[PDB]
Design a protein around this ligand. Structure first.
Ligand SMILES: CC[C@H]1OC(=O)[C@H](C)[C@@H](O[C@H]2C[C@@](C)(OC)[C@@H](O)[C@H](C)O2)[C@H](C)[C@@H](O[C@@H]2O[C@H](C)C[C@H](N(C)C)[C@H]2O)[C@](C)(O)C[C@@H](C)[C@@H]2N[C@@H](COCCOC)O[C@H]([C@H]2C)[C@]1(C)O
Ligand SMILES: [K+]
Ligand SMILES: [Mg+2]
Ligand SMILES: [Mg+2]
Ligand SMILES: [Mg+2]
Ligand SMILES: [Mg+2]
Ligand SMILES: [Mg+2]
Ligand SMILES: [Mg+2]
Ligand SMILES: [Mg+2]
Ligand SMILES: [Mg+2]
Ligand SMILES: [Mg+2]
Ligand SMILES: [Mg+2]
Ligand SMILES: [Mg+2]
Ligand SMILES: [Mg+2]
Ligand SMILES: [Mg+2]
Ligand SMILES: [Mg+2]
Ligand SMILES: [Mg+2]
Ligand SMILES: [Mg+2]
Ligand SMILES: [Mg+2]
Ligand SMILES: [Mg+2]
Ligand SMILES: [Mg+2]
Ligand SMILES: [Mg+2]
Ligand SMILES: [Mg+2]
Ligand SMILES: [Mg+2]
Ligand SMILES: [Mg+2]
Ligand SMILES: [Mg+2]
Ligand SMILES: [Mg+2]
Ligand SMILES: [Mg+2]
Ligand SMILES: [Mg+2]
Ligand SMILES: [Mg+2]
Ligand SMILES: [Mg+2]
Ligand SMILES: [Mg+2]
Ligand SMILES: [Mg+2]
Ligand SMILES: [Mg+2]
Ligand SMILES: [Mg+2]
Ligand SMILES: [Mg+2]
Ligand SMILES: [Mg+2]
Ligand SMILES: [Mg+2]
Ligand SMILES: [Mg+2]
Ligand SMILES: [Mg+2]
Ligand SMILES: [Mg+2]
Ligand SMILES: [Mg+2]
Ligand SMILES: [Mg+2]
Ligand SMILES: [Mg+2]
Ligand SMILES: [Mg+2]
Ligand SMILES: [Mg+2]
Ligand SMILES: [Mg+2]
Ligand SMILES: [Mg+2]
Ligand SMILES: [Mg+2]
Ligand SMILES: [Mg+2]
Ligand SMILES: [Mg+2]
Ligand SMILES: [Mg+2]
Ligand SMILES: [Mg+2]
Ligand SMILES: [Mg+2]
Ligand SMILES: [Mg+2]
Ligand SMILES: [Mg+2]
Ligand SMILES: [Mg+2]
Ligand SMILES: [Mg+2]
Ligand SMILES: [Mg+2]
Ligand SMILES: [Mg+2]
Ligand SMILES: [Mg+2]
Ligand SMILES: [Mg+2]
Ligand SMILES: [Mg+2]
Ligand SMILES: [Mg+2]
Ligand SMILES: [Mg+2]
Ligand SMILES: [Mg+2]
Ligand SMILES: [Mg+2]
Ligand SMILES: [Mg+2]
Ligand SMILES: [Mg+2]
Ligand SMILES: [Mg+2]
Ligand SMILES: [Mg+2]
Ligand SMILES: [Mg+2]
Ligand SMILES: [Mg+2]
Ligand SMILES: [Mg+2]
Ligand SMILES: [Mg+2]
Ligand SMILES: [Mg+2]
Ligand SMILES: [Mg+2]
Ligand SMILES: [Mg+2]
Ligand SMILES: [Mg+2]
Ligand SMILES: [Mg+2]
Ligand SMILES: [Mg+2]
Ligand SMILES: [Mg+2]
Ligand SMILES: [Mg+2]
Ligand SMILES: [Mg+2]
Ligand SMILES: [Mg+2]
Ligand SMILES: [Mg+2]
Ligand SMILES: [Mg+2]
Ligand SMILES: [Mg+2]
Ligand SMILES: [Mg+2]
Ligand SMILES: [Mg+2]
Ligand SMILES: [Mg+2]
Ligand SMILES: [Mg+2]
Ligand SMILES: [Mg+2]
Ligand SMILES: [Mg+2]
Ligand SMILES: [Mg+2]
Ligand SMILES: [Mg+2]
Ligand SMILES: [Mg+2]
Ligand SMILES: [Mg+2]
Ligand SMILES: [Mg+2]
Ligand SMILES: [Mg+2]
Ligand SMILES: [Mg+2]
Ligand SMILES: [Mg+2]
Ligand SMILES: [Mg+2]
Ligand SMILES: [Mg+2]
Ligand SMILES: [Mg+2]
Ligand SMILES: [Mg+2]
Ligand SMILES: [Mg+2]
Ligand SMILES: [Mg+2]
Ligand SMILES: [Mg+2]
Ligand SMILES: [Mg+2]
Ligand SMILES: [Mg+2]
Ligand SMILES: [Mg+2]
Ligand SMILES: [Mg+2]
Ligand SMILES: [Mg+2]
Ligand SMILES: [Mg+2]
Ligand SMILES: [Mg+2]
Ligand SMILES: [Mg+2]
Ligand SMILES: [Mg+2]
Ligand SMILES: [Mg+2]
Ligand SMILES: [Mg+2]
Ligand SMILES: [Mg+2]
Ligand SMILES: [Mg+2]
Ligand SMILES: [Mg+2]
Ligand SMILES: [Mg+2]
Ligand SMILES: [Mg+2]
Ligand SMILES: [Mg+2]
Ligand SMILES: [Mg+2]
Ligand SMILES: [Mg+2]
Ligand SMILES: [Mg+2]
Ligand SMILES: [Mg+2]
Ligand SMILES: [Mg+2]
Ligand SMILES: [Mg+2]
Ligand SMILES: [Mg+2]
Ligand SMILES: [Mg+2]
Ligand SMILES: [Mg+2]
Ligand SMILES: [Mg+2]
Ligand SMILES: [Mg+2]
Ligand SMILES: [Mg+2]
Ligand SMILES: [Mg+2]
Ligand SMILES: [Mg+2]
Ligand SMILES: [Mg+2]
Ligand SMILES: [Mg+2]
Ligand SMILES: [Mg+2]
Ligand SMILES: [Mg+2]
Ligand SMILES: [Mg+2]
Ligand SMILES: [Mg+2]
Ligand SMILES: [Mg+2]
Ligand SMILES: [Mg+2]
Ligand SMILES: [Mg+2]
Ligand SMILES: [Mg+2]
Ligand SMILES: [Mg+2]
Ligand SMILES: [Mg+2]
Ligand SMILES: [Mg+2]
Ligand SMILES: [Mg+2]
Ligand SMILES: [Mg+2]
Ligand SMILES: [Mg+2]
Ligand SMILES: [Mg+2]
Ligand SMILES: [Mg+2]
Ligand SMILES: [Mg+2]
Ligand SMILES: [Mg+2]
Ligand SMILES: [Mg+2]
Ligand SMILES: [Mg+2]
Ligand SMILES: [Mg+2]
Ligand SMILES: [Mg+2]
Ligand SMILES: [Mg+2]
Ligand SMILES: [Mg+2]
Ligand SMILES: [Mg+2]
Ligand SMILES: [Mg+2]
Ligand SMILES: [Mg+2]
Ligand SMILES: [Mg+2]
Ligand SMILES: [Mg+2]
Ligand SMILES: [Mg+2]
Ligand SMILES: [Mg+2]
Ligand SMILES: [Mg+2]
Ligand SMILES: [Mg+2]
Ligand SMILES: [Mg+2]
Ligand SMILES: [Mg+2]
Ligand SMILES: [Mg+2]
Ligand SMILES: [Mg+2]
Ligand SMILES: [Mg+2]
Ligand SMILES: [Mg+2]
Ligand SMILES: [Mg+2]
Ligand SMILES: [Mg+2]
Ligand SMILES: [Mg+2]
Ligand SMILES: [Mg+2]
Ligand SMILES: [Mg+2]
Ligand SMILES: [Mg+2]
Ligand SMILES: [Mg+2]
Ligand SMILES: [Mg+2]
Ligand SMILES: [Mg+2]
Ligand SMILES: [Mg+2]
Ligand SMILES: [Mg+2]
Ligand SMILES: [Mg+2]
Ligand SMILES: [Mg+2]
Ligand SMILES: [Mg+2]
Ligand SMILES: [Mg+2]
Ligand SMILES: [Mg+2]
Ligand SMILES: [Mg+2]
Ligand SMILES: [Mg+2]
Ligand SMILES: [Mg+2]
Ligand SMILES: [Mg+2]
Ligand SMILES: [Mg+2]
Ligand SMILES: [Mg+2]
Ligand SMILES: [Mg+2]
Ligand SMILES: [Mg+2]
Ligand SMILES: [Mg+2]
Ligand SMILES: [Mg+2]
Ligand SMILES: [Mg+2]
Ligand SMILES: [Mg+2]
Ligand SMILES: [Mg+2]
Ligand SMILES: [Mg+2]
Ligand SMILES: [Mg+2]
Ligand SMILES: [Mg+2]
Ligand SMILES: [Mg+2]
Ligand SMILES: [Mg+2]
Ligand SMILES: [Mg+2]
Ligand SMILES: [Mg+2]
Ligand SMILES: [Mg+2]
Ligand SMILES: [Mg+2]
Ligand SMILES: [Mg+2]
Ligand SMILES: [Mg+2]
Ligand SMILES: [Mg+2]
Ligand SMILES: [Mg+2]
Ligand SMILES: [Mg+2]
Ligand SMILES: [Mg+2]
Ligand SMILES: [Mg+2]
Ligand SMILES: [Mg+2]
Ligand SMILES: [Mg+2]
Ligand SMILES: [Mg+2]
Ligand SMILES: [Mg+2]
Ligand SMILES: [Mg+2]
Ligand SMILES: [Mg+2]
Ligand SMILES: [Mg+2]
Ligand SMILES: [Mg+2]
Ligand SMILES: [Mg+2]
Ligand SMILES: [Mg+2]
Ligand SMILES: [Mg+2]
Ligand SMILES: [Mg+2]
Ligand SMILES: [Mg+2]
Ligand SMILES: [Mg+2]
Ligand SMILES: [Mg+2]
Ligand SMILES: [Mg+2]
Ligand SMILES: [Mg+2]
Ligand SMILES: [Mg+2]
Ligand SMILES: [Mg+2]
Ligand SMILES: [Mg+2]
Ligand SMILES: [Mg+2]
Ligand SMILES: [Mg+2]
Lengths: 48, 275
RNA sequence: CCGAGGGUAGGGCCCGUGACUGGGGCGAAGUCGUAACAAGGUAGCUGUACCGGAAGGUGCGGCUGGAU
RNA sequence: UGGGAGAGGGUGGUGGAAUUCCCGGAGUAGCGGUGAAAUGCGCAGAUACCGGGAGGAACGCCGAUGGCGAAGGCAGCCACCUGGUCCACCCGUGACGCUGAGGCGCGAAAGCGUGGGGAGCAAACCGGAUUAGAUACCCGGGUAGUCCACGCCCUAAACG
RNA sequence: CGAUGUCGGCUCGUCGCAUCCUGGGGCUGAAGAAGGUCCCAAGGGUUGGGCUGUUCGCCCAUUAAAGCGGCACGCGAGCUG
RNA sequence: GAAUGCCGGCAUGAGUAACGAUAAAGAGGGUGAGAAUCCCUCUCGCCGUAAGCCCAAGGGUUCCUACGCAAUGGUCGUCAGCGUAGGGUUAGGCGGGACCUAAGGUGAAGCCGAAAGGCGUAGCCGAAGGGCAGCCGGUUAAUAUUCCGGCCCUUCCCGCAGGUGCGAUGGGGGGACGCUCUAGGCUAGGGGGACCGGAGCCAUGGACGAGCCCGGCCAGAAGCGCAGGGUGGGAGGUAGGCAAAUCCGCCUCCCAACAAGCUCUGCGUGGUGGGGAAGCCCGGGUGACAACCCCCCGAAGCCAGGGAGCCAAGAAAAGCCUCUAAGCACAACCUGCGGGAACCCGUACCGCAAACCGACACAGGUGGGCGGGUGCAAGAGCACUCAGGCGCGCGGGAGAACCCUCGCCAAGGAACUCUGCAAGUUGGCCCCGUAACUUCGGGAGAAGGGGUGCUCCCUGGGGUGAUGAGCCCCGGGGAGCCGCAGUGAACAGGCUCUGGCGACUGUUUACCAAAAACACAGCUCUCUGCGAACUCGUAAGAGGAGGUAUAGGGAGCGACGCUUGCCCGGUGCCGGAAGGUCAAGGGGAGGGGUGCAAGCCCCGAACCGAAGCCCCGGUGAACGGCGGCCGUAACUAUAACGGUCCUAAGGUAGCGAAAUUCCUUGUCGGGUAAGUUCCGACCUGCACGAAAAGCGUAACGACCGGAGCGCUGUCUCGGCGAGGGACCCGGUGAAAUUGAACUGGCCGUGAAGAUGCGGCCUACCCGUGGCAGGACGAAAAGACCCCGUGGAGCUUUACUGCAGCC
RNA sequence: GAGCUAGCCCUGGCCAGGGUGAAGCUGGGGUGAGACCCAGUGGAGGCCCGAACCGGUGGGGGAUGCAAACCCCUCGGAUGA
């Protein structure tokens, strides 16, 4: 049956993307944390 | 008025539709329509704030002239009478001798090809708009402003009408369609006549889908819900109300008056509505 | 081929009968009241409507086949 | 052809008296109701009185033993639309008449449907009284209904 | 109670005997026939239906008879639900 | 040494289950160390509204080639979507951007919020919507509307000619719109041809034929033709379109009107450029100078912004045209022609799937377009089949139980069972015929029947065309033929009577409930006079609604019919300017502390003083409630009647052993041979009853009872058969579970159900196919139950508080 | 976190074929005029049969599955809420 992951590049970028993160105070703290943790990517890859 | 159907389906047996007799033009004036943003009952927070709304036919809003006192003295001809999906009344197309075209709600009896006009010197004739001050007492009237220049507020529903009971200083005493006796300022405009389409209330929607077409989603009874959802929720098998009948939000819904006590307009209501 | 009739299926009319049920008629001396006949003690009758243990009552309209 | 009388019918408009409510005034200890009362309303100011307003229904005198209509029925006043009818002249058509099974229409009140409207009245119902009882008569309330429109119902001591 | 699946049916049996039938017998208020009652006896047998989830029971039609009970109210790592 | 401990390793089950749709395979020839598995050939089978093809998501090199086989591949592997390397994606016209706007988002102005932030007009962003210029063929191992060829076209810049009051983010037109039904003419696509082109073919009894087999086209500018769309012309006035306006709107007059003209598309033709089969020989060459024509069918596509009807009344903005404004009229724009200029990103490949979403090369899920032929009434249904694609990445055998899916069955025909569960039966079309009841539509495909193929003859009507032939489409009658059977295969209702519930079509517990539950039109109560009530929000602001009592909120009830009775004492709600109580505050009789005093300071009685509560009323489609005992009739029995106690009032109509009846399988009647169910009655209704509606109701129902006919393997009662498994052999090889085990029966005993203790009895060692009685077998630290001063959801006249309201 | 699911908003798209035959309209009859009746035309509907598509009724299978909801047979809707 129809599973939960229905990938959509526009949706992915507009939901979790770098610009989405920077708009909101909670989103910038995500980026802040993920740098502090040293994540190799702060944001989901989406090939546009 | 009100056409019936033969019972060739379960729903046609009771469904009735308007006769549409008075309608003379079947497409709106392109200069006078604008797109209506369907809300679905949601507000700017995106939240349902009026329940059970949505999914009805697409409509275009016809710009209606609820002032009429901005073209004082300029007569107009009744060019067409048309369907309006945004209200129960029919609307009338006016061709002002200005060349300006405007919409008004059609009063009962207004015949296409007649003249109308607005102003203190206007004939007390169906479709003319005057300040309430200048309309003779006892005249039935509609599209009545509540405060001067703020726009027609009272009696614009199909078949409605206020009546002029008397005059008291700068204020005329109106009998609103509710039966309430209110003082309205004499400078407030009003159109002599009753609103047309008085057979509107004798329409039988006939089936559930007809309500869906009107943007009316199904209404679910409090009694059919659970206590998380409603005062009337829960119970094993069916249950009576078991408390004074209440809304989803807890307030009582049988008798509990809700008009604000200290409202400044109470000075202007003489007698609350009838029956 | 037609053809008595036999068979399958579905209808219509009539008759008998049926737990139970509806009123009707009749029945020397039952129970409740007293509606009608006198102005019958609320003039009567009436079509209708609603009500009431019961006769009845009441409303609306009609009739005199109503006493003074 | 010329005339006449009429609550004949339909549509709309409108006039006063009265009842009820509501506002204002003035006023006080009761009012109302009956056979007599009680219920009821009333010092939270009723009743009685004056002014103001709202609303509905019915039209006093004229009015009669009267008039009109086929019957049921019809009554303030006005306008429009419209039926029947009588009389005079003796002008026209020349038996074109009578009745009438079916049919069609009209048909008081009550009643029904859908809207309105709702003052007074009042089935139901409530209360007071009476009474052995009183699901009655009498009294205080009171809802349909009574009124309008449209559609039904088609009954009658629809009787001379 | 860090789980012993709980009615009944179906299937499959097996056992006890306080024996329903069939075999043997005493007493009879046993003429015969057919019964009653008790004793010995568990080898075998002990029907098909209507009703109800039913066990049981009532009923139909038979029968030599239409027995009672145990096996975790036998049997759900066998089925049913 | 134990923690259902943690991490890791390795065992057991076990050479066991399985190896992922039962669409299916066989041989020959290659390659290679090695082949059921790779390549080629022939044969066989499967999909063909797909299991083919083309897009869009998503995926991201998986594409092509060479060289490889450790691992990945459920076996194998020489192969591969795997490893290594190299190669491959080309655009002014296709898509997106340099254009437009939609919801929404963001947001100069502005508003709001402790902070963070929330709003918000214009503007901006935002697409699979609007707008916009490329068609056919060829070429590569791999890209092509992109390269190449042919023939077209767009925009920008500059120039030239002609023309004009030019000029816009401003005005105006237009763009610009629904649903169903639908006309004419075309095109796509398709069928046929005795005509045209083609390498061949004559088999096995016949055919050298009007034979068989194959094909008989595509694109194309101007022009022309056919079919459509769109569109009045002129003048005068003018106060509206937030400046102006010669435009648009309005008025008047003349002219033209169902045309025409102008204009725009579609289609046909069209200079020209392409394509071109079977077969044969080795993707190619020949076929070939291929031919390229006639008839018919024909869209849901095109003309298109067509037409008609209907109500639920059907985006925006730009491009575009027009109007003028500043400014400019040596400019500028329009038209034509010419030269120049024309950027960024996508382009491989998979794409109903082995490349996407499902941990897997997973029987699941995934939007749009094309989807041929024949027949079956139609069709995208069904069977077969084209193009094209596949045989599903373990095989070989065997022919046990048993299981799955399937076929048949004597006699009986529901006897099966909770239940006809299941499976039979019926089944399409044409025609005949069709009941109660009914809201007059229905019920209805009721029920029940007859027909159905092929041949020959005669004949009616339509479409095309020419009125004819031919082709195609509906039919009518007559005579025959064959079989068990003619919708001969495949797809395609079993029916009836009667109850309950719900009117109905709908909706629901994604993943155990589809229902009688929810919704529903409709009825009633109630709130709301508009800055409405109500809702969300601290707010601003939203929704309500650009609505206004024929409207909007809330509640119940639930089409419809006939109806909905009595109780207002209690709770609620509504009304009540009196009275009573009542907080802060006003008041300050009278006190108190302190100081020498002036004073400073504290307490404080009466009295005035809101809502609320008390109090007086109203109110049931508001919460709710609607009695007991005893007696009484000329047979008995019963009690119309009476007595009395209580209540706010004592359940009315209707209905009743009921989805409600405990006793209960009530009693009686019906149906049956037999009926705890069913149906119909009765009424001592444990414990119906009137909008938590009462009683009915045609029609509807994958709802739930009961009955009957039909027909059956459900059953008496089982038998045989088929295939996929199970079994054997080769390859690969899990799992839960597991204290260790050298793991028998009985009768006992034991913590009360013993392989393990006692006494007896029985038993050589080890397997394989099977069955499930036990190992209190496995699984999940019992959901029940209790306990815990553990938790959570829910309620209220529990407590306490908060929002909100007063 | 609404790429699952639930509702709403915007913009698109999809629903083979067949059946039934409402209003209206036309003609005719009827009448004082009507109502109305008859035929034809017409093509209405939370109308009917049935693919796609949407479902998930009953049964069987599956149950360390092909699958953490699947498969087969059967069944509901299919111009509409
Ligand atoms: C399909 C396979 C699943 O098993 C089942 O569904 C069984 C039918 C399931 O039983 C159903 C059917 C049932 C009718 O009983 C047969 C019902 O009583 C129980 C409650 O549930 C097992 C027996 C059922 O177990 C029975 O459960 C009841 C409660 C107690 C029984 N105990 C008595 C033996 C026990 O046998 C369980 C609970 O389902 C088995 C359990 C181990 C798992 N349960 C589920 C998940 O639930 C776990 C517990 O949280 C809910 O999944 C189970 C087990 C993993 C299985 C095995 O996967
Ligand atoms: K329990
Ligand atoms: Mg899903
Ligand atoms: Mg996942
Ligand atoms: Mg998605
Ligand atoms: Mg995307
Ligand atoms: Mg996208
Ligand atoms: Mg998205
Ligand atoms: Mg983003
Ligand atoms: Mg976001
Ligand atoms: Mg890095
Ligand atoms: Mg992130
Ligand atoms: Mg109707
Ligand atoms: Mg009718
Ligand atoms: Mg109208
Ligand atoms: Mg516009
Ligand atoms: Mg809005
Ligand atoms: Mg917004
Ligand atoms: Mg938001
Ligand atoms: Mg709300
Ligand atoms: Mg809503
Ligand atoms: Mg309105
Ligand atoms: Mg309207
Ligand atoms: Mg005012
Ligand atoms: Mg209505
Ligand atoms: Mg609407
Ligand atoms: Mg509604
Ligand atoms: Mg609704
Ligand atoms: Mg509801
Ligand atoms: Mg509930
Ligand atoms: Mg519930
Ligand atoms: Mg919640
Ligand atoms: Mg709560
Ligand atoms: Mg609550
Ligand atoms: Mg409750
Ligand atoms: Mg409940
Ligand atoms: Mg209950
Ligand atoms: Mg409930
Ligand atoms: Mg209660
Ligand atoms: Mg409450
Ligand atoms: Mg009011
Ligand atoms: Mg014989
Ligand atoms: Mg007697
Ligand atoms: Mg009398
Ligand atoms: Mg008497
Ligand atoms: Mg008397
Ligand atoms: Mg009397
Ligand atoms: Mg008398
Ligand atoms: Mg009595
Ligand atoms: Mg009475
Ligand atoms: Mg009379
Ligand atoms: Mg007093
Ligand atoms: Mg006083
Ligand atoms: Mg009044
Ligand atoms: Mg008089
Ligand atoms: Mg007289
Ligand atoms: Mg004469
Ligand atoms: Mg009458
Ligand atoms: Mg008389
Ligand atoms: Mg236990
Ligand atoms: Mg355990
Ligand atoms: Mg366990
Ligand atoms: Mg013996
Ligand atoms: Mg013997
Ligand atoms: Mg024996
Ligand atoms: Mg037992
Ligand atoms: Mg029993
Ligand atoms: Mg036993
Ligand atoms: Mg025992
Ligand atoms: Mg046990
Ligand atoms: Mg026991
Ligand atoms: Mg027991
Ligand atoms: Mg047991
Ligand atoms: Mg089991
Ligand atoms: Mg069992
Ligand atoms: Mg077992
Ligand atoms: Mg230890
Ligand atoms: Mg463990
Ligand atoms: Mg542990
Ligand atoms: Mg561990
Ligand atoms: Mg570990
Ligand atoms: Mg290690
Ligand atoms: Mg480990
Ligand atoms: Mg290991
Ligand atoms: Mg091993
Ligand atoms: Mg084993
Ligand atoms: Mg396995
Ligand atoms: Mg498998
Ligand atoms: Mg298959
Ligand atoms: Mg072979
Ligand atoms: Mg082979
Ligand atoms: Mg090699
Ligand atoms: Mg190999
Ligand atoms: Mg090999
Ligand atoms: Mg090969
Ligand atoms: Mg991937
Ligand atoms: Mg390998
Ligand atoms: Mg190798
Ligand atoms: Mg290998
Ligand atoms: Mg290597
Ligand atoms: Mg491998
Ligand atoms: Mg695999
Ligand atoms: Mg490539
Ligand atoms: Mg180009
Ligand atoms: Mg640029
Ligand atoms: Mg911050
Ligand atoms: Mg901010
Ligand atoms: Mg954006
Ligand atoms: Mg954009
Ligand atoms: Mg776009
Ligand atoms: Mg383009
Ligand atoms: Mg082109
Ligand atoms: Mg020009
Ligand atoms: Mg210009
Ligand atoms: Mg412009
Ligand atoms: Mg528009
Ligand atoms: Mg559009
Ligand atoms: Mg529509
Ligand atoms: Mg073409
Ligand atoms: Mg064809
Ligand atoms: Mg002007
Ligand atoms: Mg050549
Ligand atoms: Mg289409
Ligand atoms: Mg078009
Ligand atoms: Mg816009
Ligand atoms: Mg110059
Ligand atoms: Mg650029
Ligand atoms: Mg490409
Ligand atoms: Mg698929
Ligand atoms: Mg597809
Ligand atoms: Mg693939
Ligand atoms: Mg998975
Ligand atoms: Mg595979
Ligand atoms: Mg073909
Ligand atoms: Mg067919
Ligand atoms: Mg295969
Ligand atoms: Mg397959
Ligand atoms: Mg063998
Ligand atoms: Mg074998
Ligand atoms: Mg199969
Ligand atoms: Mg056979
Ligand atoms: Mg048989
Ligand atoms: Mg039978
Ligand atoms: Mg039979
Ligand atoms: Mg049976
Ligand atoms: Mg059996
Ligand atoms: Mg069952
Ligand atoms: Mg069939
Ligand atoms: Mg019939
Ligand atoms: Mg019958
Ligand atoms: Mg019947
Ligand atoms: Mg019936
Ligand atoms: Mg009928
Ligand atoms: Mg039939
Ligand atoms: Mg024949
Ligand atoms: Mg033949
Ligand atoms: Mg069928
Ligand atoms: Mg239901
Ligand atoms: Mg239903
Ligand atoms: Mg009903
Ligand atoms: Mg209903
Ligand atoms: Mg439906
Ligand atoms: Mg479920
Ligand atoms: Mg759940
Ligand atoms: Mg679940
Ligand atoms: Mg779930
Ligand atoms: Mg299920
Ligand atoms: Mg359920
Ligand atoms: Mg269902
Ligand atoms: Mg539900
Ligand atoms: Mg409901
Ligand atoms: Mg319903
Ligand atoms: Mg109703
Ligand atoms: Mg109402
Ligand atoms: Mg709030
Ligand atoms: Mg708004
Ligand atoms: Mg009825
Ligand atoms: Mg009360
Ligand atoms: Mg009271
Ligand atoms: Mg009360
Ligand atoms: Mg209560
Ligand atoms: Mg009470
Ligand atoms: Mg009654
Ligand atoms: Mg019973
Ligand atoms: Mg009973
Ligand atoms: Mg009984
Ligand atoms: Mg009952
Ligand atoms: Mg029940
Ligand atoms: Mg009961
Ligand atoms: Mg019982
Ligand atoms: Mg019995
Ligand atoms: Mg019987
Ligand atoms: Mg009894
Ligand atoms: Mg209730
Ligand atoms: Mg109830
Ligand atoms: Mg009730
Ligand atoms: Mg019925
Ligand atoms: Mg019915
Ligand atoms: Mg249903
Ligand atoms: Mg159902
Ligand atoms: Mg069998
Ligand atoms: Mg086999
Ligand atoms: Mg061997
Ligand atoms: Mg091996
Ligand atoms: Mg392996
Ligand atoms: Mg050991
Ligand atoms: Mg050992
Ligand atoms: Mg042993
Ligand atoms: Mg013991
Ligand atoms: Mg033992
Ligand atoms: Mg032992
Ligand atoms: Mg031991
Ligand atoms: Mg030992
Ligand atoms: Mg020892
Ligand atoms: Mg031992
Ligand atoms: Mg021993
Ligand atoms: Mg032994
Ligand atoms: Mg074995
Ligand atoms: Mg075992
Ligand atoms: Mg065991
Ligand atoms: Mg154990
Ligand atoms: Mg065990
Ligand atoms: Mg066991
Ligand atoms: Mg635990
Ligand atoms: Mg435990
Ligand atoms: Mg547990
Ligand atoms: Mg529980
Ligand atoms: Mg316990
Ligand atoms: Mg405690
Ligand atoms: Mg404790
Ligand atoms: Mg606790
Ligand atoms: Mg919880
Ligand atoms: Mg709690
Ligand atoms: Mg707080
Ligand atoms: Mg409130
Ligand atoms: Mg999305
Ligand atoms: Mg469809
Ligand atoms: Mg269809
Ligand atoms: Mg048909
Ligand atoms: Mg027809
Ligand atoms: Mg028409
Ligand atoms: Mg139908
Ligand atoms: Mg049919
Ligand atoms: Mg299923
Ligand atoms: Mg089945
Ligand atoms: Mg499962
Ligand atoms: Mg499936
Ligand atoms: Mg259907």
């Amino acid at each position: 049956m129809k599973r939960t992951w229905q990938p959509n590049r526009r949706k992915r970028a507009k939901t979790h993307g770098f610009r989405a993160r920077m708009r909101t105070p909670g989103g910038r703290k995500v980026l802040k944390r993920r740098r502090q943790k040293g994540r190799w990517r702060l944001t989901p890859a989406v090939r546009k | 008025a009100v056409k019936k159907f033969k019972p060739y389906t379960p729903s046609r047996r009771f469904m009735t539709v308007a006769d549409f007799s008075e309608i003379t033009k079947t497409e709106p004036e392109k200069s006078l329509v604008k797109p209506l943003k369907k809300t679905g009952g949601r507000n700017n927070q995106g939240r349902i704030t009026v329940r059970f709304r949505g999914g009805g036919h697409k409509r275009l809003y016809r710009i209606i002239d609820f002032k009429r006192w901005d073209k004082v003295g300029i007569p107009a001809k009744v060019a067409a009478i048309e369907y309006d999906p945004n209200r129960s009344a029919r609307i009338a197309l006016l061709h002002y001798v200005d060349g300006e075209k405007r919409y008004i709600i059609a009063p009962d009896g207004l015949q296409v090809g007649q003249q109308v006009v607005a102003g203190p010197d206007a004939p007390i004739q169906v479709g003319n708009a005057l300040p309430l001050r200048f309309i003779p007492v006892g005249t039935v009237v509609h599209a009545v402003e509540l405060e001067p220049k703020k726009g027609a507020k009272l009696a614009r529903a199909a078949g409605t009408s206020a009546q002029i009971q008397g005059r008291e200083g700068d204020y005329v005493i109106l009998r609103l369609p509710s039966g309430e006796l209110r003082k309205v300022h004499g400078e407030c405009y009003a159109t002599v006549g009753a609103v047309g389409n008085a057979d509107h209330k004798n329409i039988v929607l006939g089936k559930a889908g007809r309500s869906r077409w009107l943007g009316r989603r199904p209404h679910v009874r409090g009694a059919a819900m659970n206590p998380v959802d409603h005062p009337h929720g829960g119970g094993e098998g069916r249950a009576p109300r078991g408390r004074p009948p209440a809304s989803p939000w807890g307030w009582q819904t049988k008798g509990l008056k809700t008009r604000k006590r200290r409202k400044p307009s109470s000075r202007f209501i003489i007698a609350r509505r009838k029956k």
